[PDB]
Amino acid sequence: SNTQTVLPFTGLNTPNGVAVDSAGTVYVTDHGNNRVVKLAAGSNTQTVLPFTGLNTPNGVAVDSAGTVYVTDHGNNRVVKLAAGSNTQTVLPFTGLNTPNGVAVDSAGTVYVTDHGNNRVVKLAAGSNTQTVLPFTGLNTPNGVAVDSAGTVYVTDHGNNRVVKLAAGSNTQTVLPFTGLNTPNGVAVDSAGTVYVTDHGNNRVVKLAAGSNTQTVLPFTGLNTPNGVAVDSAGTVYVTDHGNNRVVKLAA
Numbered sequence: 001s002n003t004q005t006v007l008p009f010t011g012l013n014t015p016n017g018v019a020v021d022s023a024g025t026v027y028v029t030d031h032g033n034n035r036v037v038k039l040a041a042g043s044n045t046q047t048v049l050p051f052t053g054l055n056t057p058n059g060v061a062v063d064s065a066g067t068v069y070v071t072d073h074g075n076n077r078v079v080k081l082a083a084g085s086n087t088q089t090v091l092p093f094t095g096l097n098t099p100n101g102v103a104v105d106s107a108g109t110v111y112v113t114d115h116g117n118n119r120v121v122k123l124a125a126g127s128n129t130q131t132v133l134p135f136t137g138l139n140t141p142n143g144v145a146v147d148s149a150g151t152v153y154v155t156d157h158g159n160n161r162v163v164k165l166a167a168g169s170n171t172q173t174v175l176p177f178t179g180l181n182t183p184n185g186v187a188v189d190s191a192g193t194v195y196v197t198d199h200g201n202n203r204v205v206k207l208a209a210g211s212n213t214q215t216v217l218p219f220t221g222l223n224t225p226n227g228v229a230v231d232s233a234g235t236v237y238v239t240d241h242g243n244n245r246v247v248k249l250a251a
Contacts, residue, residue, distance in 0.1 A: 008039070
């Protein structure tokens with residue numbers, strides 16, 4: 001598609017993150033209102049999720065069990081909310097300073113950009129061992145995504161680049177995007193196509209695996225966008241932060 005739609009969320013302010021589950025339910029961190037909201041596919045009523053003690057959300061991810069993971073800016077922590085019980089658990093990361101992007105792999109391992117510490121950390125579910133990933137020279141890293149093979153992608157926002165680490169790899173690789181400026185959101189689909197919100201240029205770009213030629217997605221009128229998500233059908237969702245809205249573009 002070359003024409004986006006606007007999801008019927010209401011009362012958003014500076015929304016910054018988006019995730020989509022297997023049923024097509026869309027989750028948004030409504031940053032300016034300190035809340036996380038969801039909208040089921042085809043619904044005209046949004047639902048505020050029962051996160052507690054939140055001090056401004058920075059990002060969101062959702063896993064196969066419908067667990068919703070949120071980075072908490074002011075409390076420097078990552079929380080998860082279990083479906084059904086609505087039990088909220090603080091993940092036992094340590095030393096966080098401004099956790100920002102969050103991603104979860106197929107094994108349930110949680111990855112977080114520690115924005116204030118210029119590092120990316122992962123933590124297996126149920127573990128008290130966190131691992132600093134061997135990215136190097138990061139500045140204000142923003143978004144993180146992980147694919148089915150365990151490859152990790154990070155928007156190294158302060159250096160205008162997107163870096164990649166294959167599982168078990170010794171060295172990060174910079175993806176051949178062109179003209180990036182303050183990139184923030186990142187997502188990866190089932191085929192390893194990488195989607196990046198090129199925030200400084202008010203656009204969203206993608207790169208297929210092995211490609212040296214990015215495609216600029218035909219969104220329109222974006223204003224300081226941030227979070228991006230992609231569903232199993234390849235539909236791309238973007239938090240259009242500066243316009244207080246979330247937009248959707250089918251493949």
